[PDB]
Short mmCIF file of C-alpha atoms and ligand atoms in Angstrom, two decimals:
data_model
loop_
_atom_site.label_atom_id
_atom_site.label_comp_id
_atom_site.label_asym_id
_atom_site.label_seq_id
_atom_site.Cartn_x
_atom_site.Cartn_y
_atom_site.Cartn_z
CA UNK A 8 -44.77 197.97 -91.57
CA UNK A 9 -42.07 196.79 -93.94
CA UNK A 10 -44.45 195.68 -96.67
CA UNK A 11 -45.43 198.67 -97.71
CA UNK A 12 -42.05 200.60 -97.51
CA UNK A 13 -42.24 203.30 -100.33
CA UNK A 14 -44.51 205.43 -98.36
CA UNK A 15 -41.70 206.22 -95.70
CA UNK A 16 -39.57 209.16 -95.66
CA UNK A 17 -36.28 209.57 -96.61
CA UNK A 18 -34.75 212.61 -94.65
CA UNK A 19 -31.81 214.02 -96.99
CA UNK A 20 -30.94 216.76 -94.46
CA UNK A 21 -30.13 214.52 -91.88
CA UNK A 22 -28.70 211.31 -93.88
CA UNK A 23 -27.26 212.30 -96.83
CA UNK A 24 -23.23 212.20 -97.38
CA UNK A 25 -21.36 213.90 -99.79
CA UNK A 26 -19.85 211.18 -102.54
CA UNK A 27 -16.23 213.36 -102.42
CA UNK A 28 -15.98 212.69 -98.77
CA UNK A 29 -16.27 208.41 -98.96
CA UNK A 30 -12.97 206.68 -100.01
CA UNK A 31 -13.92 203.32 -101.61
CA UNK A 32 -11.91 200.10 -100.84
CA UNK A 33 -12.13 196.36 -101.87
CA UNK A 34 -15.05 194.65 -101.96
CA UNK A 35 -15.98 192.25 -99.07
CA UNK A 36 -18.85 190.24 -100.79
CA UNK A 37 -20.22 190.04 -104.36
CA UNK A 38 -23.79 188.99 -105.62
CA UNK A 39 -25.17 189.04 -109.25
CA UNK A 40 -26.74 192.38 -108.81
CA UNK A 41 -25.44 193.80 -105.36
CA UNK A 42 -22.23 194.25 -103.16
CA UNK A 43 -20.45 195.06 -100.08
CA UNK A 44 -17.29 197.16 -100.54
CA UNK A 45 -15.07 198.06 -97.70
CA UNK A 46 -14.59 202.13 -97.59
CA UNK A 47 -13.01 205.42 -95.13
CA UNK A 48 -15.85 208.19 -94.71
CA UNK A 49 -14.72 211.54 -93.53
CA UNK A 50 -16.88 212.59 -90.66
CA UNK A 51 -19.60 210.36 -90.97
CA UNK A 52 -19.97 210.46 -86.58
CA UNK A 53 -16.99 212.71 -85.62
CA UNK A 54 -16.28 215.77 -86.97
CA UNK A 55 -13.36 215.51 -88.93
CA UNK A 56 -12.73 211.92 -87.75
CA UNK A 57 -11.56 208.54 -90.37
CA UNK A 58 -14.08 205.54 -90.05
CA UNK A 59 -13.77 202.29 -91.44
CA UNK A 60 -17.59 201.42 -93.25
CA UNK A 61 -19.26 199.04 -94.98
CA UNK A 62 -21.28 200.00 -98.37
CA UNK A 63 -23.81 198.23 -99.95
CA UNK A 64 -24.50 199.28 -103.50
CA UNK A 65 -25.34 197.67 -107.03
CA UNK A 66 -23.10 196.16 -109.42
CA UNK A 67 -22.96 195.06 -113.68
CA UNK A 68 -26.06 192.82 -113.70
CA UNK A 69 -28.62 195.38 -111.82
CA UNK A 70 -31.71 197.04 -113.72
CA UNK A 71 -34.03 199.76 -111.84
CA UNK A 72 -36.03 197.38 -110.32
CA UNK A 73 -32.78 196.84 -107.75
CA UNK A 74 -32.42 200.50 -107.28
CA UNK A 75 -35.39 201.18 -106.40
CA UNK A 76 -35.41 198.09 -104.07
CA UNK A 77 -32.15 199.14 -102.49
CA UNK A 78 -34.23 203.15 -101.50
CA UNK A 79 -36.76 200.79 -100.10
CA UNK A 80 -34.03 199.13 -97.67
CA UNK A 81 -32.85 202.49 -96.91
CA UNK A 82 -36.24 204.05 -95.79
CA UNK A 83 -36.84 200.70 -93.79
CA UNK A 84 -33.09 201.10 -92.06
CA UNK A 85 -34.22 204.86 -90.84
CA UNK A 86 -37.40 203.60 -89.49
CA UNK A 87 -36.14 200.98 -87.32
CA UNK A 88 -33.74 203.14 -85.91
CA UNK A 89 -30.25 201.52 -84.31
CA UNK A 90 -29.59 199.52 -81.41
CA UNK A 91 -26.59 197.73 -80.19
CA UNK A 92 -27.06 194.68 -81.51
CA UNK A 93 -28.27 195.26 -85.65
CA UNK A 94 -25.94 196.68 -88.07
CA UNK A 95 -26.24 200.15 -87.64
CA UNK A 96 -27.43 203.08 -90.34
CA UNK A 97 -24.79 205.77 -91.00
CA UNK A 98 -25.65 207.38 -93.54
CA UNK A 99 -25.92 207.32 -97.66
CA UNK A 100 -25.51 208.64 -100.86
CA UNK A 101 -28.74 209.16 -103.14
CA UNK A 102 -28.15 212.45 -105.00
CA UNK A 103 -27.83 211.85 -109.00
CA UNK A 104 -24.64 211.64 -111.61
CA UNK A 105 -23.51 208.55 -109.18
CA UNK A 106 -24.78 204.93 -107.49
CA UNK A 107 -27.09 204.62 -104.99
CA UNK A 108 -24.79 203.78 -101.71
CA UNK A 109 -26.08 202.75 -98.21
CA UNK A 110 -23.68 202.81 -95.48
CA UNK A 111 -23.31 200.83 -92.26
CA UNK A 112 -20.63 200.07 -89.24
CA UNK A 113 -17.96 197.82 -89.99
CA UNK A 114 -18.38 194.92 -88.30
CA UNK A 115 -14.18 193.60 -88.58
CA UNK A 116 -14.79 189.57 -87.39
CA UNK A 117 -17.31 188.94 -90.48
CA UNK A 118 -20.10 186.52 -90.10
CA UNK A 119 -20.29 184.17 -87.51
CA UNK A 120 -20.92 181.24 -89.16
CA UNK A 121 -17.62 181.17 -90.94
CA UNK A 122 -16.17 183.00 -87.46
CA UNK A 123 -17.36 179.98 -85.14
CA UNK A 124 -16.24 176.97 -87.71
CA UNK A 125 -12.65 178.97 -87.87
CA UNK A 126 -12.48 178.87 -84.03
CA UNK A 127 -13.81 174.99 -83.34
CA UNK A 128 -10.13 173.29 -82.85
CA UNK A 129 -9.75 176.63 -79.67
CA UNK A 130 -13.35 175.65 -78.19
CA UNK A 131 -12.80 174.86 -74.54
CA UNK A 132 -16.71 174.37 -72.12
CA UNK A 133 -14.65 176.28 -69.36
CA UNK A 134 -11.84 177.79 -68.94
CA UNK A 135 -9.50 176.02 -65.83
CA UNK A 136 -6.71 178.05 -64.26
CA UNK A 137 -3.46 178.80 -64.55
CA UNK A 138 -2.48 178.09 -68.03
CA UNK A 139 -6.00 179.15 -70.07
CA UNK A 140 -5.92 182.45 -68.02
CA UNK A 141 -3.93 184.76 -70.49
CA UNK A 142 -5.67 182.48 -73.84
CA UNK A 143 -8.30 183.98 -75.91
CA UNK A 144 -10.23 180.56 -76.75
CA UNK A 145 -14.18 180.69 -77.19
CA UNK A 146 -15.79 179.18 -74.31
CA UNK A 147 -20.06 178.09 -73.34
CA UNK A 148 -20.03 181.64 -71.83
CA UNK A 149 -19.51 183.15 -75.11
CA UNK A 150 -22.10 181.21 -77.15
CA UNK A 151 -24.51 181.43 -74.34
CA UNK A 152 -23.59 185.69 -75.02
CA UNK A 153 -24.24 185.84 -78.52
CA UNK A 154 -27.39 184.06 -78.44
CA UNK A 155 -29.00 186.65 -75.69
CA UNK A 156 -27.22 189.38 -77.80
CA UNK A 157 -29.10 188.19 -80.84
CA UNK A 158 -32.20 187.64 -79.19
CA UNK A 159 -31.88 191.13 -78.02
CA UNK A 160 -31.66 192.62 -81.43
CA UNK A 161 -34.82 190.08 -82.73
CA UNK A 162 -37.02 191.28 -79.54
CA UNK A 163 -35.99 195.07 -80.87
CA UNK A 164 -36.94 194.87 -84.74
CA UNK A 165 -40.24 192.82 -83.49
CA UNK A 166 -40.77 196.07 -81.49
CA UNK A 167 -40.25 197.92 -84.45
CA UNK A 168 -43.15 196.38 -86.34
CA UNK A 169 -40.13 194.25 -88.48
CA UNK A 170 -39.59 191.02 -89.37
CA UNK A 171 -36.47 189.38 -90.77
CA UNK A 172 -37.45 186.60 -93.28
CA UNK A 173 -33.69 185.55 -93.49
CA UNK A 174 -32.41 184.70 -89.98
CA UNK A 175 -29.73 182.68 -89.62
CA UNK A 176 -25.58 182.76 -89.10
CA UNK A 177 -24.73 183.60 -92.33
CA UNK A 178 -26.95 186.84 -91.55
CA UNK A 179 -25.26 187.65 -88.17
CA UNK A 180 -21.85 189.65 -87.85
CA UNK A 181 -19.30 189.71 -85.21
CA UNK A 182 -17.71 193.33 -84.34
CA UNK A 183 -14.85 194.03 -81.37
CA UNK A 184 -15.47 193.52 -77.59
CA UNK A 185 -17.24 190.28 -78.64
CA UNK A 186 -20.64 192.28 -80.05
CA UNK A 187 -22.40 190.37 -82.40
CA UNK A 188 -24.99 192.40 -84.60
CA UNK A 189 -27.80 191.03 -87.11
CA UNK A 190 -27.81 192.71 -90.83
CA UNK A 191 -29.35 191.15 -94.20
CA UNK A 192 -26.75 191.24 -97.00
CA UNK A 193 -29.96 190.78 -99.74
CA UNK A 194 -28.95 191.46 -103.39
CA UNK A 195 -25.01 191.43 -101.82
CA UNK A 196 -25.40 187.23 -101.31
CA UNK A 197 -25.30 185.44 -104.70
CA UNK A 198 -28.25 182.99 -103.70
CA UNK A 199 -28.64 181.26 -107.19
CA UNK A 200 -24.77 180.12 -106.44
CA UNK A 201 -25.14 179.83 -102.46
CA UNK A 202 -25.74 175.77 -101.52
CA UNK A 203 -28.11 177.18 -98.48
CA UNK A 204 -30.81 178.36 -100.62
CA UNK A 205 -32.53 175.93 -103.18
CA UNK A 206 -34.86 176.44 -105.54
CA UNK A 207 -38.77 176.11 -105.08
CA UNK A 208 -41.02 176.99 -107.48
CA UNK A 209 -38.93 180.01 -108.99
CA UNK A 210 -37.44 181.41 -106.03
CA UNK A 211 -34.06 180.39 -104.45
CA UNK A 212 -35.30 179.44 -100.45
CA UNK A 213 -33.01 179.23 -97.38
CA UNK A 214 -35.43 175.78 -96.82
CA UNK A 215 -33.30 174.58 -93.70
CA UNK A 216 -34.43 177.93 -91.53
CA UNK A 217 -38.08 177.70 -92.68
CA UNK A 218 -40.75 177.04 -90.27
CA UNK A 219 -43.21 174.69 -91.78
CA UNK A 220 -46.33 177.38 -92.28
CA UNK A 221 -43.22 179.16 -94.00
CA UNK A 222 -42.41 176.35 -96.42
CA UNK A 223 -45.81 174.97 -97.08
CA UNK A 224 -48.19 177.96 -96.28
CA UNK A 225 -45.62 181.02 -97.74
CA UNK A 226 -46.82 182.36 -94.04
CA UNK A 227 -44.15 185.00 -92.49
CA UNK A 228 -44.29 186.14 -89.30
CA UNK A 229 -42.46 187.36 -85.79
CA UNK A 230 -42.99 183.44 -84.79
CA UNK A 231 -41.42 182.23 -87.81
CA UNK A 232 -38.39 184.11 -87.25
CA UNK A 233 -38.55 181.96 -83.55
CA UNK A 234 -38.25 179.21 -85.87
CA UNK A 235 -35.43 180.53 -87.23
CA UNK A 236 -33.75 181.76 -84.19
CA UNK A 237 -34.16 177.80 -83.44
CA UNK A 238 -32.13 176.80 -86.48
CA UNK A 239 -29.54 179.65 -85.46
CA UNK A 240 -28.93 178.31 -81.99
CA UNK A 241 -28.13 174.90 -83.57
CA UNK A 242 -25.12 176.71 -85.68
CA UNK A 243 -23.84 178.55 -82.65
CA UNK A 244 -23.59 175.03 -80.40
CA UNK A 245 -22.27 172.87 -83.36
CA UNK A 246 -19.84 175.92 -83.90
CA UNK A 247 -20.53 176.70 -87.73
CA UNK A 248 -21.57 172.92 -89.03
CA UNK A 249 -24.39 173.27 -91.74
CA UNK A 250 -27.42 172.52 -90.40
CA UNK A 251 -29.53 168.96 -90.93
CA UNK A 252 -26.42 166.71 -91.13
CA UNK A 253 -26.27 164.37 -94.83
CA UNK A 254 -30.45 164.69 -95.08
CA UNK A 255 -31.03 165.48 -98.82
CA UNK A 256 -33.83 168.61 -99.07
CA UNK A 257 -36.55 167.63 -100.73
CA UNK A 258 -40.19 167.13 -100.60
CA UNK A 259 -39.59 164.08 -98.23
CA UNK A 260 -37.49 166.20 -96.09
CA UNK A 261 -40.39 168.83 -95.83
CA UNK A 262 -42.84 165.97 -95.09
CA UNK A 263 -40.91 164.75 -92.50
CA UNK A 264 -40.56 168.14 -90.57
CA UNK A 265 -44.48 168.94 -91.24
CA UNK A 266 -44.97 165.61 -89.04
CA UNK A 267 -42.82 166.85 -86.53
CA UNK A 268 -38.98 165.02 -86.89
CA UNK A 269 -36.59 167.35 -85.62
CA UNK A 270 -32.36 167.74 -85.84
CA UNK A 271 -30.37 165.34 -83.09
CA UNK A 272 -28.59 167.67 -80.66
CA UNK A 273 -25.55 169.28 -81.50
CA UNK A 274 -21.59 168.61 -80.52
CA UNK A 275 -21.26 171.17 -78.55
CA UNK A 276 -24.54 171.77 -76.90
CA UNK A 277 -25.90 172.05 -72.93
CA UNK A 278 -29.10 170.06 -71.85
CA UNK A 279 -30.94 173.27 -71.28
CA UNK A 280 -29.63 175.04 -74.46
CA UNK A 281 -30.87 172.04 -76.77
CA UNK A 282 -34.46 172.18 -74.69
CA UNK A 283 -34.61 175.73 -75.76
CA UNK A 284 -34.24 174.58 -79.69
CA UNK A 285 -37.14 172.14 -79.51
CA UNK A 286 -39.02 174.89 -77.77
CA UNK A 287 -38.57 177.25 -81.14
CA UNK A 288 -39.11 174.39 -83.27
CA UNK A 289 -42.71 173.95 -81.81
CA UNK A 290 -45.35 172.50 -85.05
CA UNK A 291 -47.38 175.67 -83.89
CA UNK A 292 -46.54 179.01 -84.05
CA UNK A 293 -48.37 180.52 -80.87
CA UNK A 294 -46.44 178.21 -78.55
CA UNK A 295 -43.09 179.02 -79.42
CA UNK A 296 -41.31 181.37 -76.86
CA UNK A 297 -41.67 185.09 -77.90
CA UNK A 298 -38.40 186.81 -78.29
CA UNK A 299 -38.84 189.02 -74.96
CA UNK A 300 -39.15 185.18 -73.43
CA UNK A 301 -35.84 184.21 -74.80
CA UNK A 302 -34.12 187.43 -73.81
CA UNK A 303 -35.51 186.73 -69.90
CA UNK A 304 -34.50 182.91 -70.26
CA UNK A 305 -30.80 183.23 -72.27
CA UNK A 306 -30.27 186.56 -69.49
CA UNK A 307 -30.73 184.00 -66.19
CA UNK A 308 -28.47 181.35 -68.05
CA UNK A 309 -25.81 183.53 -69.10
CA UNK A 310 -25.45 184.23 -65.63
CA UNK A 311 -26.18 180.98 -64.19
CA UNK A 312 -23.22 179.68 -66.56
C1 LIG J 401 -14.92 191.84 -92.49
O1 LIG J 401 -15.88 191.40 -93.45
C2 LIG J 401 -17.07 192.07 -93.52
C3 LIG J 401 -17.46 193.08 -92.68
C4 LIG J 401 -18.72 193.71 -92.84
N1 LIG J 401 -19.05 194.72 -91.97
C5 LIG J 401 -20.26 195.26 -92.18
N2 LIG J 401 -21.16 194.94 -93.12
C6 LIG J 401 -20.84 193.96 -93.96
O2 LIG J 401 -21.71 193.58 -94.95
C7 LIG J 401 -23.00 194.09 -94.94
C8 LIG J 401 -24.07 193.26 -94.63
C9 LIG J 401 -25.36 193.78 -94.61
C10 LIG J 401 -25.58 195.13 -94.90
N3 LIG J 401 -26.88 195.70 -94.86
C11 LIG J 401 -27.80 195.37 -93.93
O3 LIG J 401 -27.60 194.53 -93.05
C12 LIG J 401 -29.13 196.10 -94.03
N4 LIG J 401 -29.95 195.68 -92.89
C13 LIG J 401 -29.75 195.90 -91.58
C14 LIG J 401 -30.79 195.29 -90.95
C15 LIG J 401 -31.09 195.21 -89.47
C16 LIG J 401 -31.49 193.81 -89.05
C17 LIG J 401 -32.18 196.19 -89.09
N5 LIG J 401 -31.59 194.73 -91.92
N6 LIG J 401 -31.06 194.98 -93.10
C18 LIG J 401 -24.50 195.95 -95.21
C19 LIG J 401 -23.22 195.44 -95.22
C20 LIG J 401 -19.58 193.27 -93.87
C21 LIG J 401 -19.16 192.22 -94.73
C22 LIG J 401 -17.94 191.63 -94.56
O4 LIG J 401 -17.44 190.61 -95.33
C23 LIG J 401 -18.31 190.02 -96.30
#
């Protein structure tokens, strides 16, 4: 349903929020034509009550073509409706004499990627009493967590008729009480300057979380976000290294994966947690797990851990 996004509605009654009553901050992330600025709304949720937001908007650069993009992301956002575990809708400002603003919960950790490599020297598989009792380190619980939260959140936008296109942990962000929550940042990431994305054809690609049919076929679906989820789960259990370890991506690369070479296990990594990885880097899309499969098998882990 999010190809053909301009025929959804956008409900001003219910989601629009006056400009006067948003108190813009610094910015958290910068693109060429997009951004992410930190703000305090005025009621947004409580009457009367301060909340720390996020707000994407446009920048120096943009043309039309990005605003009306950016009312296409907002009439998506309203039709998927929130959930725990995605970056949650909260309201926005479309009315003219000012920029088009979308705004979202704060999410105060960042992205997890950066979050995970920051925390590698704390790692500890499990934590032995007396001493690591009152320490907050990360342990195999906790990245066992976040993957069944994010699979959670993928098995909820699939329900929605959604697909991501961009999964990985760049595009997941960590929020208190050790949520983690899956948003785009789009325009907001400058991908012509960002080393994960490289350039095929035209386009800048994120080629190390493309399924093959995605790479050589231009194919997007619910199973090629599995693919993705794959390359995700890597991240989490090398905590934060960059995926596909001093292999140069090019057309041999792409080749290589086609025929079915796959990534060694990761540093940090369980014997069943690695299994799962090969199982969403399967050369055919059907028999990779479905999300609501992961969510069943990362749920009986996570306890079993
Ligand atoms: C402490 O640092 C940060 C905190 C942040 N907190 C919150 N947001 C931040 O950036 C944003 C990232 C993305 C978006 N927009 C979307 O995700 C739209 N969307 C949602 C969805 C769902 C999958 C259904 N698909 N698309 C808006 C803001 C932060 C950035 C920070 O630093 C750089």
């Amino acid at each position: 349903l999010d190809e053909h996004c301009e025929r959804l509605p956008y409900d001003a009654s219910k989601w629009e929020f006056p400009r006067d009553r948003l108190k813009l901050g610094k910015p958290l992330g910068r693109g060429a034509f997009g951004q992410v600025i930190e703000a305090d709304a005025f009621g947004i949720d409580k009457t009367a009550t301060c909340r720390t937001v996020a707000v994407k908007m446009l920048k120096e650069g943009a043309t039309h073509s990005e605003h009306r993009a950016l009312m296409s992301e907002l009439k998506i956002l309203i039709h998927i409706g929130h959930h725990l575990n995605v970056v949650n809708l909260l309201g926005a400002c479309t009315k003219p004499g000012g920029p088009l603003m979308v705004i979202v919960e704060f999410c105060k950790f960042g992205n997890l990627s950066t979050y995970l490599r920051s925390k590698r020297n704390e790692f500890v598989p499990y934590k032995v009493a007396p001493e690591d009792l009152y320490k907050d380190f990360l342990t195999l619980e906790h990245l066992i967590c976040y993957s069944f939260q994010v699979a959670k959140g993928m098995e909820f936008l699939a329900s929605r008729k959604c697909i991501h296109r961009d999964l990985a942990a760049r595009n997941i962000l960590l929020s208190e009480k050790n949520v983690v929550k899956i948003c785009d940042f789009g325009l907001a990431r400058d991908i012509y300057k960002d080393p994960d994305y490289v350039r095929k054809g035209d386009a800048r690609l994120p080629l190390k979380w493309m399924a093959p049919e995605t790479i050589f076929d231009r194919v997007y679906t619910i199973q090629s976000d599995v693919w993705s989820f794959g390359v995700l789960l890597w991240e989490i259990f090398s905590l934060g290294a960059s995926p596909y370890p001093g292999v140069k991506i090019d057309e041999e690369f792409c080749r290589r994966l086609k025929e079915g070479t796959r990534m060694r296990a990761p540093d940090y990594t369980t014997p069943e947690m690695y299994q799962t990885m090969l199982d969403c880097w399967h050369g055919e899309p059907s028999q990779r797990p479905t999300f609501s499969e992961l969510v069943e098998h990362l749920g009986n882990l996570l306890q079993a851990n």
